[PDB]
Structures are given as structure tokens and as C-alpha cells.
Design a protein around this ligand. Structure first.
Ligand SMILES: COC(=O)[C@H](Cc1cccc(C(=N)N)c1)NC(=O)CNS(=O)(=O)c1ccc(C)cc1
Ligand SMILES: [Ca+2]
Length: 223
């Protein structure tokens, strides 16, 4: 996260860290046994870490649980990042409490102008690299599709939405991928892609979760 602030230990209880010997992606706990993340974060041998703040120090509220199954969206296109979403089932249900909680799925799609909370342990520099050990937070508004396409010229599908600032300076970054974008207490997006980080007229692009609720629900019900 670039231009954000330190969230505070466990103030974002649904945030998870995907670890394969090191943190490589974020994720969101949607219930005691399932996590949602980005399809481009797919990898075998994933361990989910819950209740994390400083990912390099055992602080006492963590739950480390291995994944038993990973399900990338059937229509994920790695070239365009369309349908960049994946579900991860935990080998065992996590113990939910004040520091480890799930985030609800949306019942409707959020509108441009809505303020959302984005979080992660990704790079904090727009130029060069500097990885924080504690969770960073960023408040950012959903941008209109027209204002976005008009700025980045990049290809934005109906399963994506831009959030951030066209002036640059604040944005999600490398290592934040798969992380949550929460608006109105519901999971509305997943950190997906962008051109560099916090560059002017290059806002972050997120997976539009409201379009996948049916798939998520059905998949969780049969797996
Ligand atoms: C990959 O390294 C990076 O610094 C960022 C990471 C990232 C991830 C998720 C969201 C954001 C964000 N800004 N909100 C940033 N992405 C890039 O810089 C990618 N742009 S890119 O134009 O460099 C590019 C595009 C496609 C390929 C195969 C490789 C590189
Ligand atoms: Ca820790």
C-alpha cells in the first residue's frame, strides 16, 4: 500500500496472509473454512495465516492453517486478468473471535463515489521498494468506469472496477494482490492489478466481487 496508514493490530480481522515460506499475497476470510483471493495468486503448498499484524513476529493471535483445496475461477484469463478470483478451503475451520473474523459477501454492487478500505503488506514505495512488516490501510473511492477507461486506456472489463486517485500518490501495490477492498462493511473487491503503483492517471484495478456471489456460494456449498 502506497500513501496509506498503519491500520493497527487486528483492526482488519478478515485480512489473511497467504504464505509459501514467505508472504506472497493477501486474502479475505469469508467464513470459518474458506478464503477468497486473486486467481493470479494461485500456487500449490499454500498456508493461510490469520490474526496477523507483524508478519515477521509471532505476536499471539495468529492461526496458521494449511489449504486443502484451491479453486481458480473457471473463466480466469491470465492475460487480461478477467475473472481474477480464487477460493481456498482450509484444512480445518479457523477459530473465529475478535481478532479473527469473516467479512460478509455483498448483496449489491457498490457505486462509484463510495469510500472503501483497502489493506495489505505490499510495497509502500511508488519508486523503489520497501516492504512493511505490519498491516497498512488505505481509504479510497470507487471511480466511475468512464473516468477510468478515459485515463488509463487499459482494458477494463465488466468484472473489474477502478478505485483510488487519478492524481496518484495513494494506491495498492505489489504484495497487496488478493487483498480485500471493503465498502459498507461488505467485501466489494479484490486487489488485482495496476500499472506500476500510485502513478498519476493509473489507478488500481480490482475484481468486482458482486458479480461472483452466486459462484462463490455454489462452490462453497459443494466443496
Ligand atoms: C508486479 O509489480 C508491481 O510493482 C505492480 C503490482 C501491483 C499488483 C496489484 C495492484 C497494483 C496497483 N497499482 N494497484 C500493483 N504491478 C505492475 O506494475 C504491473 N504493470 S506492468 O505494466 O509493469 C505489467 C503488466 C503485465 C505483465 C505481465 C508485467 C508487467
Ligand atoms: Ca505475526
Amino acid at each position: 500500500i502506497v500513501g496509506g496508514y498503519t491500520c493497527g493490530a487486528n483492526t482488519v480481522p478478515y485480512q489473511v496472509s497467504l504464505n509459501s515460506g514467505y508472504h506472497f499475497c493477501g486474502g479475505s476470510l469469508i467464513n470459518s473454512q474458506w478464503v477468497v483471493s486473486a486467481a493470479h495468486c494461485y500456487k500449490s503448498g499454500i498456508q493461510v495465516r490469520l490474526g496477523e499484524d507483524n508478519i515477521n513476529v509471532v505476536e499471539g493471535n495468529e492461526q496458521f492453517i494449511s489449504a486443502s483445496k484451491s479453486i481458480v475461477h473457471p473463466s480466469y484469463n491470465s492475460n487480461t486478468l478477467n475473472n481474477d478470483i480464487m477460493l481456498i478451503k482450509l484444512k480445518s475451520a479457523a477459530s473465529l473471535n475478535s481478532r479473527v473474523a469473516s467479512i460478509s459477501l455483498p448483496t449489491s454492487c457498490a457505486s462509484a463515489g463510495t469510500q472503501c478500505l483497502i489493506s495489505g503488506w505490499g510495497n509502500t514505495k511508488s519508486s523503489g521498494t520497501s516492504y512493511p512488516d505490519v498491516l497498512k490501510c488505505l481509504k479510497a473511492p470507487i471511480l466511475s468506469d468512464s473516468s477510468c477507461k478515459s485515463a488509463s486506456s487499459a482494458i477494463i472489463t465488466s468484472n473489474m472496477f477502478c478505485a483510488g486517485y487519478l492524481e496518484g500518490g495513494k494506491d495498492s501495490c505489489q504484495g497487496d494482490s488478493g487483498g480485500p477492498v471493503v465498502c459498507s462493511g461488505k467485501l466489494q473487491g479484490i486487489v488485482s492489478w495496476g500499472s506500476g503503483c500510485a502513478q498519476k492517471n493509473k489507478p488500481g484495478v480490482y475484481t468486482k466481487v458482486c458479480n461472483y456471489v452466486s459462484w462463490i456460494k455454489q462452490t462453497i456449498a459443494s466443496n
